[PDB]
Design a protein around this ligand. Structure first.
Ligand SMILES: Nc1ncnc2c1ncn2[C@@H]1O[C@H](COP(=O)(O)OP(=O)(O)O)[C@@H](O)[C@H]1O
Ligand SMILES: Nc1ncnc2c1ncn2[C@@H]1O[C@H](COP(=O)(O)OP(=O)(O)O)[C@@H](O)[C@H]1O
Ligand SMILES: [Ca+2]
Ligand SMILES: [Ca+2]
Ligand SMILES: [Ca+2]
Ligand SMILES: [Ca+2]
Ligand SMILES: [Ca+2]
Ligand SMILES: [Ca+2]
Ligand SMILES: [Mg+2]
Ligand SMILES: [Mg+2]
Ligand SMILES: [Mg+2]
Ligand SMILES: [Mg+2]
Ligand code: NA
Ligand code: NA
Ligand code: NA
Ligand code: NA
Ligand code: NA
Ligand code: NA
Ligand code: NA
Ligand code: NA
Ligand code: NA
Ligand code: NA
Ligand code: NA
Ligand code: NA
Lengths: 510, 510
């Protein structure tokens, strides 16, 4: 179908003969410069290549406001997610309309020149409530208040080049490129599948049903920009994707990576995804259970209904101009050894089985087996590879402040003890001396699979610098992970407590 | 580099706005029509897409002649293999210069409109001797005299569409497309690897050395048009290729199928391959041992020297305008467990190992093991899949004419006997009654893995219709595959002879 708004806004193509000129300007000693943030680099690349058509810059207050209260651009164009350039008060204060800002990447690569139309200070609470449903634990809300700048700069863009990427070089097809791909193959019907997690049996089956129902070819269009904190990294996923694509019949599917920065905005996000996929050349778009939803909040309540997205997309049906292929919870049927939409089976006279993400995360962490029927073995292998079981995980033991025994001697004792176990883990007594340049390495080591013995705590002001994962506190404090009986407890006693704790948590296996 | 001649002759692009017009003409009740042969469909697709640049139609006598005696087109452009439209006397007699012929595919799809320049009757002997070196067993020479028409029709072409293909739809990149592929990835150095056989360890290693030596990305450009009779089918090969490509480091290689019709013209063919690859956008081209050679003739003598191609290519070096990466026999080194060019090892103080094609063909036919070091297991699996060991092969037993026992009873006896063995083969008493519509099916069954019991021989005039593979003759004749003692030999005796014969040839395994 035609790109949203009718015109593919490929600004790279549009501004081709301005490149050298824009480049010079971007590099002049007088232009205002802003180094794009990660999500901003994700958004600007979708703007510059026509993925966010009709958009051609970041939303101004008028357009932004309409999107928030209307799910539409000022002119009425259906648009649910606000795309804005958030900056800080400092930078904002140097901006005036008509001003031209050079937007860089990594403070080195000139991406584009923004021509300021306005500088406003959004009410983050309204955006939070109206666009993301207001739950503070919601990924987009947390980002909004904790990472996003407090001042938005609206304005038109002029392309210099798309953000640089050294991985998966040929796979990040642009709307124009993908459209050309489908064309060279004479694909006039393509159903797109959005995804931010690895694909298992259910997915393969559901995407194939879609291809069969829609009579269209399959586009696995995974998100590699930004997703939900805690998601499997995109590299591990691209591998999972390239592997699973070999399970489809020869010539039915195409893989293309989408550098989109998700918002986990359930239903609004689905409407947005459909618009994006249409721009990219898809004729059909899959919207399954809890599309783009972030699950439940700590209280166990749903951020979005399991089918809110489907319903919203359905209400915008005649406007989207792209066909939606809805799916009900696709589950496993033991007795018939096959998958199928829950709405097609009698959950009364037929038994179903389902390994949830939580459940999977768990197996991977304990080294537990994952059913042959759940996912393909190569997929699981790749997952295990980058999400190793506890006996392969790294960790850190911190000698609490309450500790009264010799920290040096307790450290050595723990070191020598861990060493005798053997098995491949690297151990080290890591003194940070409160230097953040060191504190910031604690997780690099844990991430490398190493066991670190830390002689003492770090200032509370520096706590943010350290990634809490697999970091355990040894102390008499009630809030210690490994609680000591008393600050003067004999070393050997402490060592056994720590060993058994780590063994109880899968780090050690004898 | 620039395409040969300087201009990419993508006639599909050139004649885009003529398509509807050419189409109408091609489909008029008055235009002369010729349905392209297989190799002709191979050649015309390389002409229409700029692969044979500078060519823009089939060679006329002037150009043809110069290519034969000069390895150059009339204007001097380096060109070693003659590309002509060979027709029969009947068709030829209706052609006059200025005439326009509609060239169809499968008598249904209009490919192009040829504007006749001349109609000549080539001296096949000269072409055989001068271009293919005159050995009658040479693949190109046999085709020349046994398949090629005796009259060549030279003339310019006007594109309607490239030949239709329903398999590997997106993989058959055109020069322009490939060039666009390399570009979108910013590949300014690409070394192309030609191939018509499956790729094993040696190949992967040799193409990687090339990539490293040349400082260029890898293009696996296999031939899927026409190769040498007896080669592994291209489908099996594409699978082998798609699998082996996964053994290269991420992002270093690209796979694109070339619908070229090989000539197995050793050195001349190599020069031609380099020109073709240059047109397709390559900056480097690999030329290894016996490039494009058909091996030895039945007498055991070489059609070309193991490095004739390398030497010819080298002599045209400053003309080819594409860098050649020559390789000496790449062999295996047991003790160092690695491959390397023979010219880099001391064949005196180091042992080498090599499983030749013949040797491989043999293992595959006996179900023999293929060294882990020779090829990758997935590749070998795919090969075995379409080149099954004897116990899975089909065959046919023919009751010779000399036979004097009851043909009906001997047939049944052989049928019931084979049946008791079990094992999965399908058996049938196949009566052909000399009807070619039936004789032509004999190989389809053998190909399907079935065992056919044929009650009697077929007329000699019909012999050509039958594929001699796995077709054994039971007769008293000295020239019988399973020789009987006498035409009246008792059935049970004959049955044992046949059983033991088939068991001795791997068809039966107990
Ligand atoms: N078991 C399932 N039943 C129905 N739909 C599913 C199922 N699993 C995944 N989907 C759908 O597949 C798509 C991508 O899945 P996933 O990556 O987990 O979520 P997200 O929408 O956040 O990308 C979504 O449309 C989702 O609703
Ligand atoms: N062992 C080897 N050492 C060096 N080059 C090789 C070796 N095997 C194959 N090659 C080269 O690989 C390319 C393709 O191989 P193949 O398909 O067998 O022959 P062809 O040249 O007929 O396409 C050729 O350039 C050939 O010379
Ligand atoms: Ca704030
Ligand atoms: Ca629920
Ligand atoms: Ca005490
Ligand atoms: Ca003849
Ligand atoms: Ca030889
Ligand atoms: Ca007798
Ligand atoms: Mg980028
Ligand atoms: Mg989900
Ligand atoms: Mg074709
Ligand atoms: Mg060879
Ligand atoms: Na439309
Ligand atoms: Na810098
Ligand atoms: Na709801
Ligand atoms: Na519409
Ligand atoms: Na429809
Ligand atoms: Na426990
Ligand atoms: Na040149
Ligand atoms: Na016909
Ligand atoms: Na002669
Ligand atoms: Na060079
Ligand atoms: Na020679
Ligand atoms: Na024998």
């Amino acid at each position: 179908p035609a790109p949203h708004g009718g015109i593919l806004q490929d600004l790279i193509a549009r501004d081709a003969l301005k490149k050298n000129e824009l480049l010079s300007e971007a590099q002049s000693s007088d232009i205002l410069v802003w180094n794009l943030t990660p999500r901003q680099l994700c958004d600007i690349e979708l703007i510059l290549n026509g993925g966010f058509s009709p958009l051609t810059g970041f939303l101004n207050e008028n357009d932004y406001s309409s999107v928030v209260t209307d799910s539409r651009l000022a002119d009425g164009t259906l648009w649910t997610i606000p795309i804005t350039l958030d900056v800080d008060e400092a930078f904002a204060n140097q901006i005036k309309p008509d001003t031209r800002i050079a937007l860089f990447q990594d403070d080195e690569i000139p991406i584009a020149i923004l021509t300021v139309q306005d500088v406003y200070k959004p009410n983050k609470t309204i955006e939070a409530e109206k666009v993301f449903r207001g739950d503070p634990e919601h990924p987009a809300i947390s980002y909004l208040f904790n990472v996003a700048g407090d001042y938005y700069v609206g304005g038109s863009l002029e392309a210099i080049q798309l953000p640089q990427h050294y991985d998966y070089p040929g796979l990040r097809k642009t709307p124009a490129q993908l459209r050309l791909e489908f064309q060279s193959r004479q694909w006039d019907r393509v159903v797109a599948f959005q995804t931010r997690n690895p694909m298992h049996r259910a997915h393969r089956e559901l995407t194939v049903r879609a291809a069969r129902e829609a009579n269209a070819k399959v586009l696995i269009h995974p998100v590699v920009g930004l997703t939900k904190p805690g998601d499997i990294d995109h590299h591990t996923r691209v591998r999972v994707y390239q592997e699973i694509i070999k399970r489809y019949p020869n010539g039915i599917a195409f893989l293309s990576l989408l550098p989109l920065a998700m918002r986990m905005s359930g239903d609004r996000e689905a409407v947005w995804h459909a618009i994006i996929r249409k721009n990219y050349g898809a004729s059909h778009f899959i919207v399954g259970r809890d599309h783009a939803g972030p699950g439940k909040n700590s209280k166990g309540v749903d951020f979005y209904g399991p089918y809110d997205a489907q319903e919203l997309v359905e209400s915008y049906k005649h406007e989207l101009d792209i066909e939606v292929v809805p799916f009900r919870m696709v589950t496993y049927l033991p007795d018939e050894d096959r998958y199928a939409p829950i709405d097609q089976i009698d959950t009364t006279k037929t038994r179903t089985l389902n390994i949830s993400g939580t459940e999977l995360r768990r197996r991977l962490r304990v080294g537990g087996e994952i059913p042959e029927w759940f996912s393909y073995p190569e997929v699981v292998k790749i997952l295990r590879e980058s999400n190793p079981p506890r006996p392969k995980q790294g960790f850190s033991i911190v000698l609490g402040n309450s500790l009264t025994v010799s920290r040096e001697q307790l450290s050595i004792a723990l070191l020598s003890t861990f060493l005798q176990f053997g098995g491949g883990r690297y151990y080290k007594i890591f003194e940070h001396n409160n230097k953040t340049e060191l504190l910031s390495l604690i997780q690099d080591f844990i991430g490398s699979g190493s066991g670190l013995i830390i002689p003492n705590q770090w200032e509370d002001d520096k706590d943010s610098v350290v990634g809490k994962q697999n970091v355990y506190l040894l102390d008499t404090s009630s809030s210690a992970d490994i609680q000591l009986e008393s600050a003067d407890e004999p070393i050997s006693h402490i060592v056994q407590k720590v060993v058994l704790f780590l063994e109880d948590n899968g780090f050690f296996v004898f």
